[PDB]
Design a protein around this ligand. Structure first.
Ligand SMILES: CCCCCCCCCCCCCCCCCC(=O)OC[C@H](COP(=O)([O-])OCC[N+](C)(C)C)OC(=O)CCCCCCCCCCCCCCCCC
Ligand SMILES: NC(=O)C1=CN([C@@H]2O[C@H](COP(=O)(O)OP(=O)(O)OC[C@H]3O[C@@H](n4cnc5c(N)ncnc54)[C@H](OP(=O)(O)O)[C@@H]3O)[C@@H](O)[C@H]2O)C=CC1
Lengths: 342, 293
């Protein structure tokens, strides 16, 4: 290895770990947690931030001085990509847009960009790549999310044969856009879950295991080429979770079997707002699509990471949702949500 | 066009509420060897615009343990009140010449205590609870001195019709007959007076209190033909009072609560009663009872 890359120190902030990460899109739900874990043992992060530095300012206090090197880039510029990963041991990609935008179509964020970084980073001389792909993604899905991620996943794997692909099932956390999303029904009237939601099962995973997997995938040599599926330790019918998290929030559970065709139009009506849409037609059916349990794909336990159940790692994110009426409460209280356990 | 007259009052008062703040900071500034806002625009002329649009762009954080319903209607009342008592002022000719204008002014200005009381309760914090409790008791203590002063003042006026005040004063400022009450009245006005609103609510109260004190004690001559004479005199008098109102803002250590109640109930209330007794018999004493009609 390069002379100024040998791991040193006991893993502190001012200890050179050796990994030279270039995390893409760190200003997100998962990017903050991974860049923290990469900053927690002393890896010089080279993130191209693109938004205002103010929104990227909160990433400063998770690394030693002169470690988190903010860089300017453009998504539609190859030269922008080339500069940031010119000298990097690894490159980590999380470019993802949950809703549909005018400037970026859904395939722009999942077909062009994920492959647009693999070949140039290989051209620059990288050694690794941890581009992630949603586990639920399917080529013939009715959601643009699952189609676009699948077709981009093969391109990045083909362009970079050693590109480890992570398959997160449902990364729940503080602002995971599921738990708060499920909490968001309180203002939006009756929960418009279709057919009362008795026909869809999800397997969610607590986010920091996934980031722990990413760093583990970085230091594990076997990760190159392989594809990892990241799922939690228990799965739930979505009617349980909505009743569950409403009970953890102690809010009045108010389910309503709204017809599928109604929510289809309503989803795009939510998108009419020019700013960040609350709900997208791509997510209307993405929720109602269940999870697969492909066994041949190695998981967290094979990678050396135990998966925390959602029940235990819920009170952290949940406390924001509950008002004073049960703010002082603690864990338990809500029933242990019944798992179907594959 | 009567609606246009309302906007011809509410907005400029709203701007008047906006624009004496730069007066405050620069008066308070130049008082302490300082300069006040003078770098943003000429002499801080654009400083009020420099803060207001910033405030409306700031996200209004809401406490987790806050009742939203009360947290948003308390400013609704606070602004609604602060821009309502401007309507019966006998400024040239009042918008509303209510025959009981003084009573209406008192009942609706005494209603401001609900806004601060609700704000402390809705906020639901140890600081907010006591601060609301302290503010309201300080306030609810001081209408009894307010009401008696105004009542005893109006014996020599003739009625509660605010327009009649001009006819009563005419010859001399009414302070010369009740100057012990003027200091009695002026001091009481100091203590009686989302977060973006609360600037506006109490602040219009500050100017209107001085506008109310202006017509009450330092009247002017309203020529029937030319009304501009009363306009200039009314504005000039209420400006001098307000400058004095901020003159004392940075000239005394602030009152403490036990003295604040002690000052009224033991050194302000009993003397207010005597003056009221003096001004209830004196119109009878000299056969100078005034005409109501
Ligand atoms: C024939 C004549 C008939 C009428 C005669 C009337 C009686 C004779 C005159 C009496 C004194 C004058 C009238 C009352 C004045 C107040 C009396 C009082 O309690 O004083 C002591 C009071 C209390 O003083 P104290 O608390 O130190 O002592 C009181 C007595 N013990 C100790 C027993 C409690 O003084 C104050 O409250 C101090 C002022 C408080 C407010 C702070 C700001 C002051 C700003 C002053 C400048 C601006 C003035 C503006 C005036 C209006 C302009 C439009
Ligand atoms: N609930 C979820 O978030 C789920 C996410 N995933 C996938 O996992 C990853 C999660 O990443 P995370 O950071 O948490 O996601 P976020 O949506 O929270 O943030 C995405 C990040 O990527 C940037 N970004 C996205 N699209 C573009 C684009 N077209 N051009 C430039 N920058 C872009 C964002 O910039 P900016 O901050 O300005 O928007 C931000 O930095 C993504 O691959 C996502 O699709 C999978 C399942 C669920």
């Amino acid at each position: 290895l390069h002379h100024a890359l040998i791991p040193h120190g006991k893993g502190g902030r001012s200890s050179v770990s050796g990994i030279v990460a270039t995390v893409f899109g760190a200003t997100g739900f998962l990017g903050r947690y991974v860049v923290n874990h990469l900053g927690r043992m002393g890896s010089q992060v080279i993130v191209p931030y693109r938004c205002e530095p103010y929104d990227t300012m909160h990433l400063r206090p998770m690394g030693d001085l002169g470690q988190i090197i903010f860089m300017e880039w453009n998504g539609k510029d190859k030269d922008s990509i080339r500069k940031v990963v010119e000298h990097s041991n690894v490159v980590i990609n999380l470019v993802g847009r949950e809703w549909e935008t005018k400037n970026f179509d859904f395939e722009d964020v999942f077909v062009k960009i994920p492959h647009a970084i693999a070949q140039v980073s290989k051209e620059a001389g990288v050694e690794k790549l941890i581009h992630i792909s949603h586990l639920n993604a399917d080529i013939k899905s009715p959601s643009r999310y699952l189609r676009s991620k699948a077709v981009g996943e093969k391109e990045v794997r083909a362009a970079f044969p050693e590109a480890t692909i992570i398959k997160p099932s449902d990364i729940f956390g503080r602002e995971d856009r599921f738990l708060n999303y499920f909490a968001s029904m309180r203002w939006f009237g009756g929960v418009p879950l279709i057919s009362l939601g008795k026909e869809t099962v999800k397997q969610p995973v607590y986010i920091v295991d996934v980031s722990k997997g990413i760093i583990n995938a970085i230091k594990d040599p076997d990760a190159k080429g392989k594809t990892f599926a990241f799922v939690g330790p228990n799965r739930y019918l979505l009617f349980d979770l909505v009743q569950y998290i409403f009970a953890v929030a102690y809010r009045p559970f108010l389910p309503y079997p709204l017809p599928h065709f109604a929510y289809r139009w309503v989803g795009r009506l939510f998108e009419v707002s020019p700013f960040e849409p609350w709900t997208t037609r791509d997510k209307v059916e993405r929720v109602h699509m269940s999870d697969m349990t492909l066994p041949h794909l190695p998981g967290l336990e094979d990678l050396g990471i135990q998966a925390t159940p959602l029940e235990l790692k819920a009170i952290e994110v949940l406390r924001r949702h509950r008002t004073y009426r049960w703010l002082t409460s603690e864990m338990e209280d809500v029933k242990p949500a019944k798992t179907v356990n594959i | 066009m009567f609606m246009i007259n309302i906007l011809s009052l509410i907005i400029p008062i709203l701007l008047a509420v906006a624009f004496l703040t730069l007066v405050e900071r620069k008066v308070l500034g130049y008082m302490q060897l300082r300069k006040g806002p003078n770098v943003v625009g000429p002499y801080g002329l654009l400083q009020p615009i420099a803060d207001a649009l910033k405030l409306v762009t700031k996200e209004p954080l809401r406490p987790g343990t806050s009742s939203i319903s009360m947290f948003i209607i308390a400013p609704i009342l606070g602004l609604s009140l602060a821009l309502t008592m401007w309507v019966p002022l006998p400024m040239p000719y009042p918008l509303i010449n209510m025959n009981l204008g003084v009573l209406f002014m008192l009942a609706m200005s005494s209603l401001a205590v609900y806004s601060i009381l609700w704000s402390g309760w809705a906020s639901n914090s140890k600081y907010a609870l006591i601060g609301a409790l302290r503010a309201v008791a300080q306030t609810i203590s001081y209408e009894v001195t307010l009401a008696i002063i105004l009542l005893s003042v109006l014996l020599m006026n003739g009625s509660y019709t605010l327009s009649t005040l001009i006819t009563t004063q005419e010859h001399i400022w009414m302070i010369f007959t009740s100057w012990p009450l003027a200091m009695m009245w002026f001091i009481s006005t100091l203590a009686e007076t989302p977060f973006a609103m609360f600037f506006m609510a109490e602040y219009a109260n500050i100017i209107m209190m001085n506008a109310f004190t202006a017509i009450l004690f330092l009247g002017a001559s309203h020529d029937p033909h030319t009304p501009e004479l009363y306009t200039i005199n009314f504005v000039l008098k209420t400006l001098a009072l307000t400058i004095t109102f901020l003159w004392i803002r940075a000239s005394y250590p602030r009152f403490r609560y036990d003295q604040l109640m002690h000052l009224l109930w033991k050194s302000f209330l009993p003397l207010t009663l005597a003056l009221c007794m003096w001004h209830i018999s004196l119109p009878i004493m000299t056969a100078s009872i005034p005409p109501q009609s």
